[PDB]
Write a protein that holds these residues in place. Structure first.
Motif, short mmCIF file in Angstrom:
data_model
loop_
_atom_site.label_atom_id
_atom_site.label_comp_id
_atom_site.label_asym_id
_atom_site.label_seq_id
_atom_site.Cartn_x
_atom_site.Cartn_y
_atom_site.Cartn_z
N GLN A 176 0.82 -1.21 0.00
CA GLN A 176 0.00 0.00 0.00
C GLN A 176 0.86 1.27 0.00
O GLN A 176 0.36 2.38 0.24
CB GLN A 176 -0.94 0.00 1.20
CG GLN A 176 -1.97 -1.12 1.16
CD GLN A 176 -2.84 -1.15 2.40
OE1 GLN A 176 -3.53 -0.18 2.71
NE2 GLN A 176 -2.81 -2.27 3.11
N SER A 177 2.15 1.10 -0.28
CA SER A 177 3.09 2.20 -0.33
C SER A 177 4.15 1.92 -1.38
O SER A 177 4.38 0.78 -1.77
CB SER A 177 3.76 2.41 1.03
OG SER A 177 2.92 3.13 1.92
N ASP B 295 -2.33 0.73 -3.12
CA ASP B 295 -3.37 0.81 -2.11
C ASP B 295 -4.50 -0.18 -2.40
O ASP B 295 -4.72 -1.12 -1.64
CB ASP B 295 -3.95 2.24 -2.01
CG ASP B 295 -2.92 3.27 -1.54
OD1 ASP B 295 -2.03 2.93 -0.72
OD2 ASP B 295 -3.01 4.45 -1.97
MG MG Z 1 -0.29 4.41 0.13
#
Ligand code: MG
Ligand code: ANP
Ligand code: MG
Length: 299
Positions: free
Chosen positions: A94-95, A242
């Protein structure tokens, strides 16, 4: 899809054809993306979006629910102790984590290593209560090769030393050779497709992220168009990390753009490598020493 307020059988067919197969892609869409479907009026477009949001429950959250949200993040071991530590556990999903170093400082090596570590079930750290085994089952990686430095030998080798099957990594790793920023960006956007084909893509690599751009836009006077193009690419990369809860990695050679985790790697004496974490959302700056040998990253 027909569960969505207003969405019927015909509309469902349109949406699936425009890429919108799941709710989250609809709950996070803009009334524009959807209306540009033709037959999908601004009316129904707003309704199905208000709905898709509700079902996916995208509202205000507080208290203990905030921790629940933060636990949906799983991490990937870099095979280095000091590095995983400096990473606060390891490469986050998610990054977008970026390693920016100097010529031969290890960027590509770290990239390959990750593709391999993905096929080592034990190397993905997560809370089983927020991330079930099924979600991380048959994980696959996409490797967008910008410099043409993907080396299948090097994968096989790192695997053998890790005690796993290199052919298994080769089978679960999609490599796309980009020759320019257009191909690079497009391949990136086409990832959503491999996922709808039933590919549990959990690791994305862009090596390099900034190479084609520098070459295509050396003119430091037409910088605008460029930085826009590059920033739009990143937006896709992030959204991508994400919505599909997967680790995205990028390399950037250096002697401005968004990137949630920033590393600066440099050569040491021999194997020695110094990774310096200078930017991240919740971790302090820090240095991690590791090395690169026939086995890959170690220590
Ligand atoms: Mg993110
Ligand atoms: N099979 C191997 N065994 C031991 N060391 C290796 C092996 N393969 C690569 N290396 C090491 O990897 C180094 C190259 O690191 P590399 O991943 O290419 O850095 P880089 O960030 O990609 N540099 P650049 O692409 O030029 O910006 C070599 O100079 C070797 O020390
Ligand atoms: Mg490289």
């Amino acid at each position: 899809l027909t569960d969505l307020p207003g969405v019927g059988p015909s509309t469902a067919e349109k949406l699936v054809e425009a890429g919108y197969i799941d709710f989250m892609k609809i709950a996070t869409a803009t009334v524009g993306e959807l209306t540009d479907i033709e037959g999908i009026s601004e009316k129904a477009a707003a309704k199905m979006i208000m709905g898709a949001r509700d079902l996916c429950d995208l509202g205000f959250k507080s208290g203990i629910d905030l921790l629940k949200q933060r636990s949906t993040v799983w991490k990937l071991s870099t095979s280095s102790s000091e590095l995983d530590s400096v990473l606060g556990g390891g490469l986050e999903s998610q990054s977008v984590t970026e390693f920016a170093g100097v010529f031969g400082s290890g960027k590509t090596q770290i990239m390959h290593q990750s593709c391999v570590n993905l096929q080592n079930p034990e190397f993905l750290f997560y809370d089983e209560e927020a991330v079930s085994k099924g979600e991380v089952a048959q994980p696959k990686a996409v490797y967008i090769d910008t410099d043409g430095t993907f080396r299948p030998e090097r994968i096989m080798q790192m695997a053998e030393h890790a005690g796993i099957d290199g052919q298994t990594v080769l089978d679960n790793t999609f490599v796309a050779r980009a020759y320019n920023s257009d191909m690079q960006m497009l391949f990136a956007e086409k990832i959503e497709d491999l996922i709808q084909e039933g590919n549990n893509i959990k690791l994305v690599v862009i090596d390099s992220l900034t190479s084609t751009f520098r070459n295509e836009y050396t003119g430091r006077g037409k910088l605008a168009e460029r930085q826009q193009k590059l920033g739009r690419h990143m937006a896709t990369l992030n959204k991508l990390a994400d919505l599909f809860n997967c680790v995205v990695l990028v390399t950037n050679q250096v002697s401005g753009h968004a990137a949630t985790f920033r590393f600066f790697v440099r050569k040491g004496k021999g194997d020695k490598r110094v990774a310096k974490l200078y930017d991240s959302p919740h971790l302090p700056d820090a240095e991690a020493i590791f090395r690169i040998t026939e086995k890959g990253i170690q220590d």
